[PDB]
Design a protein around this nucleic acid. Structure first.
Length: 296
RNA sequence: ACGAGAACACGUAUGCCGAAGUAUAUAAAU
């Protein structure tokens, strides 16, 4: 159960809906997809790395601070500053759950949150009839994000030791390919470091009555009734396309799927599952929904 | 099996065009 930390040195585009849209963090779905396809490019055995690996969503970090997303618990007071905040440092993570975080404290934390910036890159396309004959060029836009020199992303993983070694190898291999969006266009390379934060390790090693879903998950058919007993949650529509499956890419697109977001609180833990979103393809296409809980 | 995948912020044009380093004033009072 080691955690990986990522550095890019070149901006990467994530994106939610349109190429000009930009993001800082990705969900476990994309990471699982990318790691899987990288395994397939290496051509190793997927079953081991199919139903044994547990991954968190990606999370931003700064020079020396690690953060987690905001738990959607019901705090009874200001209800303005707390809305604007997304991420919490580990220093006061349990303090916020208790209620020690002050409104001015939230103000301060939010102030420190400068961990990158967003930008729009313009690109022009002359593959059209602009060069061939009488026509115009095709400008379009992309959205990219530039992390600070000591800023990047990290995930929290758990599984068997053999699973961890395989993940290590695959992560190395992927290091040089991309992630995010326009990988081949010059965005999203990375060098990674495995660091063990004692405090975060403790954070994973608590025990309590609540539990914070850190990944993008959704229980099976036969667990949902008992899972949804007392929860505070957000649904997050996940859509997207697929790579080297059927003849027409524009014809291929995994069906819109829904999962809980990454700040929900649950009473009854559920194991998740890797759901097939496949239809009319030459292979099954995997979307990831399996939780990693922080039990407090 | 990464809201993906393809896509040169490209192609046209330059520092021009007119202006005088000019205007008088003894190599001089023994």
């Amino acid at each position: 159960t080691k955690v990986f930390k990522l550095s890019f040195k070149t901006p990467v585009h994530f994106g939610k809906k349109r190429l000009s849209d930009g993001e800082m963090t990705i969900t476990a779905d994309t990471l699982f997809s990318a790691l899987f396809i990288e395994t397939l490019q290496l051509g190793k055995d997927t079953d081991w790395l199919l139903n044994d690996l547990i991954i968190s969503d990606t999370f931003p970090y700064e020079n020396e601070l690690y953060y987690l997303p905001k738990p959607l618990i019901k705090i009874d007071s200001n209800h303005k500053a707390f809305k604007k905040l997304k991420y919490v440092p580990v220093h006061h993570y349990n303090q916020y759950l208790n209620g020690e975080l002050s409104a001015e404290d939230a103000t301060d934390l939010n102030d420190i949150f400068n961990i990158g910036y967003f930008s729009l890159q313009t690109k022009v396309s002359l593959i059209a009839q602009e060069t061939d004959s009488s026509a115009d060029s095709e400008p379009y836009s992309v959205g990219t994000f530039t992390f600070e020199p000591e800023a990047g992303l990290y995930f929290i993983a758990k599984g068997s030791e053999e699973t961890l070694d395989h993940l290590n190898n695959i992560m190395t291999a992927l290091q040089y390919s991309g992630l995010g969006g326009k990988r081949n266009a010059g965005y999203g390379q990375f060098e990674y470091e495995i660091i063990n934060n004692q405090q975060l390790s403790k954070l994973l090693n608590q025990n309590g009555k609540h539990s914070i879903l850190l990944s993008t998950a959704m229980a099976k058919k036969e667990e949902i009734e008992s899972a949804l007993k007392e929860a505070r949650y957000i649904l997050t529509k996940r859509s997207g396309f697929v790579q080297s499956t059927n003849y027409s890419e524009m014809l291929v697109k995994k069906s819109d799927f829904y999962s809980f977001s990454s700040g929900s609180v649950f009473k009854n833990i559920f194991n998740g599952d890797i759901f097939n979103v496949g239809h009319n393809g030459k292979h099954p296409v995997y979307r990831y929904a399996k939780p990693l809980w922080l039990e407090v």
